[PDB]
Design a protein around this ligand. Structure first.
Ligand SMILES: Cc1ccc(-n2nc(C(C)(C)C)cc2NC(N)=O)cc1
Lengths: 328, 266
């Protein structure tokens, strides 16, 4: 029914992922979204490392169609770039070619918590904010910001540059804004910001700030109030409008968290509350979403004008101590 | 809405605003079989098929517009013999609806929609029932996505038109008509040749001329190549003369019989 000459000609010209790239046995990731391989070019024109994602499922799924639509348009140094898309007609699989990021904040933080340079924390924070700002300006929300989705480039031209990504799940609620936990129906820019504040806290202390063992999650809220304190009416007036506000009042008493505050938590982890670092962190981790700082306002904070200045390479020219990715 | 303000750095702009000369050169292979007049009548016909498919499936105008652009982009490069346009139309609707976030229209529902619109609304063009099943749609979707170089986000003149009329203070007076004229511009090549805002300005100008509204000062106060907008107004005016002189229902069966036909394997 389709024209034969047309078919055989396109089939002849079609670049096939198995012909262009060496990747068998080099699987570095597996999750909800599908498998990610560390790939090298067979025809040795580049000789640089690439990430090959095979999208879970078959054909052009809703989710496949969304990743392609967006990533085909987005262009920013601090967001993961789509290099190429392979459609495999034989098995209906879609393959996405990304540039290879050797590191990410999950492994970097885990490596430090197992045991750096002046301004690696600040630089990481700045580049994260820069990329989220770019996405937010284009009305793209991340909706699952966490250390594992903050990639960091290894040796090469983009050494130490942060790449925001969405890797899926290999779920935990440690990075989830209190409004989501109280049943908020929609994702917002402010929800991404809270997650960036949680990452910033974790970069300063090496521990997740809200670590914890349907939309309502009691223990997760217990740990937030154990760190931040229980909010006053004045601090979050629209809390009354959250669907699970009545369950919150049923289950919790302000009195329980009377000794608790972010000042006290951070002090225990040897971060001084008179520091610009802390004063920025407090604006990111504000409980009422409308009272939360925006990504652009964060970028303009005097924290980033105080010594040391943030650098393009977050490693500041230093040798990288972290191991390469293990194959699976 | 995603990428709302990104036009000037978008794939639409950087890859899918074509030169007219290149377009008409690629068109010459279908002009061995069809006249120029007949090719344009074909374009109109399939703009109405897509619209009818959209309406039946209850899709918003923006989803219908994107699907119409995908179809246009495909036959801007390739011949009508390459893939049957009767298969391509509903495939474009199927893909567009996923991108613009309506949902994956179910197999049963897409095929029943295609079958039913052709039977009830286009029997003057098609004697036989819709022959394609879903395996065919799924195949065609892969070819469509490849030809478009995975460029899915499409900008249209509806949003700028809304912004322009709001600024005028003439929403109720002009928007109904100007919005209608924008629908009609998809009967032409305009979306392949001009940035969407320029098309918006041209339609709003024609709505103003038709409704005897003086908007000369407002247009003058804009910083735009007013010559480029005159070119678009001319194509809109020419289109309504083709509409008047075109009896789609007498002519299309014969025109569709003259289309070059896809060769089968040896
Ligand atoms: C289904 C799906 C999966 C992943 C994405 N995605 N989104 C992003 C943003 C950070 C731009 C938001 C990145 C990705 N995918 C990826 N491999 O990085 C988008 C859609």
């Amino acid at each position: 029914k389709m024209d034969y000459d047309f078919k055989v000609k396109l089939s002849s010209e079609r670049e096939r992922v198995e012909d262009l790239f060496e990747y068998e046995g080099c699987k570095v990731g597996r999750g909800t979204y599908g498998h990610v391989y560390k790939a090298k070019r067979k025809d040795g024109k580049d000789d640089k490392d690439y990430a090959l994602k095979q999208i879970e499922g078959t054909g052009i799924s809703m989710s496949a169609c969304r990743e392609i639509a967006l990533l085909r348009e987005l262009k920013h140094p601090n967001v993961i770039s789509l290099q190429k898309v392979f459609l495999s007609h034989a098995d209906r699989k879609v393959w996405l070619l990304f540039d290879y990021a050797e590191h990410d904040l999950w492994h970097i933080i885990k490596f430090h918590r197992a045991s750096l340079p002046r301004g690696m924390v600040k630089s990481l924070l700045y580049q994260i904010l820069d990329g989220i700002h770019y996405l937010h300006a284009n009305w793209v929300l991340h909706r699952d910001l966490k250390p594992a989705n903050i990639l960091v480039m290894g040796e090469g031209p983009e050494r130490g540059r942060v790449k925001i990504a969405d890797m899926g799940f290999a779920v935990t609620f440690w990075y989830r804004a209190p409004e989501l936990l109280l049943g908020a129906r929609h994702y917002t820019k402010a929800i991404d910001i809270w997650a960036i504040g949680c990452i910033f806290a974790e970069l300063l202390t090496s521990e997740p700030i809200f670590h914890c063992r349907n939309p309502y999650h009691h223990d997760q809220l217990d740990r937030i109030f154990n760190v931040m304190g229980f909010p006053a009416d004045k601090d979050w007036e629209d809390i009354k409008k959250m669907p699970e506000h009545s369950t919150l009042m049923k289950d919790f008493r302000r009195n329980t968290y009377t000794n608790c505050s972010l000042i006290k938590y951070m002090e225990k982890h040897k971060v001084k509350p008179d520091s610009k670092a802390f004063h920025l962190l407090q604006k990111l981790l504000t409980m009422d979403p409308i009272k939360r700082i925006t990504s652009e306002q964060a970028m303009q904070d005097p924290y980033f004008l105080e010594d040391p200045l943030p650098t393009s390479d977050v490693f500041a020219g230093c040798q990288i101590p972290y191991p390469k990715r293990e194959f699976l | 809405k995603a990428m709302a303000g990104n036009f000037w750095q978008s794939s639409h702009y950087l890859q899918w605003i074509l030169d007219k000369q290149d377009l008409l050169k690629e068109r010459q292979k279908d002009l061995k079989f069809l006249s120029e007049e007949e090719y344009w009548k074909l374009q109109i016909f399939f703009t109405n098929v897509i619209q009818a498919l959209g309406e039946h499936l209850k899709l918003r105008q923006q989803v219908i517009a994107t699907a119409t652009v995908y179809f246009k982009r495909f036959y801007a490069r390739y011949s009508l013999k390459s893939i049957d346009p009767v298969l391509m139309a509903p495939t474009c609707v199927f893909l567009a609806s996923k991108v613009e976030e309506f949902g994956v229209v179910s197999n049963t529902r897409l095929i029943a929609a295609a079958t039913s619109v052709l039977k009830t609304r286009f029997s003057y063009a098609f004697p036989k029932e819709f022959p394609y099943r879903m395996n065919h749609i799924l195949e065609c979707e892969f070819y469509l996505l490849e030809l478009m170089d995975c460029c899915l986000i499409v900008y249209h003149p509806y949003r700028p038109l809304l912004q322009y009329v709001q600024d005028m203070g003439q929403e109720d007076m002009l928007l109904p008509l100007a919005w209608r004229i924008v629908n009609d511009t998809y009967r032409t090549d305009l979306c392949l040749l001009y940035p969407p805002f320029m098309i918006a300005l041209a339609c709003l100008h024609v709505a103003c001329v038709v409704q005897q509204k003086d908007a000369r000062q407002w247009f003058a106060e804009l910083s735009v190549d007013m010559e480029k907008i005159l070119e678009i107004i001319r194509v809109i005016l020419k289109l309504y003369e083709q509409w008047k002189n075109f009896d789609e229902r007498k002519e299309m069966a014969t025109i569709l019989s003259k289309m070059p036909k896809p060769k089968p394997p040896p």
